[model samples]
Target: GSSGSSGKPLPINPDDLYVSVHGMPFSAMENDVRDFFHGLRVDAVHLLKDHVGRNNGNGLVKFLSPQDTFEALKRNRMLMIQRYVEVSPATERQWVAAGGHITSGPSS
Candidate 1:
């Protein structure tokens, strides 16, 4: 994995609002992820790719707002393509910084 990361992750917040999507099928695509958050404002869905250039069958979907994340988590364990996607609240310890950490940049 990566290292040297820090941030005020959402899940650890008082509301702890956010969902982690797991058990993704390699066949899953952006449209599929959109379906995962169907009816919600899907801000973004990032799929993981291995060095060889292939869908790792994993990704992260960020919502337009925290509440959207909450809604997805509520009805988790829903079916994906070939398997059931595991949706759960991302624990405080689970978050790794995708943006700049506290050592630099504005807190925005």
Candidate 2:
């Protein structure tokens, strides 16, 4: 609907703040990943799975506001579960629609 700090109009309707964490411990779970953003308010922690449905040492985290997501991104390449992890902004393609196409929706 509207753009945030990216200075570009969004192709999808905005929702909760999201970040995709990489290089996490393979054995990591939702709780383990959650600890990375412990200093912030987290709406949810979702461990990402491969096409085979296996935890791939990555995760998707959710926040109530874009501010929270921004703070989390600042922690990119930081340690998590004893290993450094990269936290990147989740693009519109990363989010899926409910009862519709598996996308954020049509682009602007």
Best by TM-score: 2
Give the TM-scores of the predictions, in the order they appear.
0.61, 0.66
1-108 per-residue lDDT for model 1 (tens digits): 879868765553522443467778777777778766778777666566677766666555655477668778776787677777877765433434322112335677
Deviation (Å) of 33 in candidate 2: 1.4
lDDT for position 35 in model 1 = 69
* Candidate 2 residue spans exceeding 4 A from truth: 1-16, 51-53, 97-108
Which parts of model 1 have CA positions greater than 4 angstroms off?
Answer: 1-18, 91-108
- The candidate that wins on lDDT is 2
lDDT of 2 by residue, 23-56 (tens): 8876777767656777777776767677776667
Q: What is the lDDT of residue 70 in candidate 1?
A: 78
Local distance difference test, each candidate: 0.62, 0.68
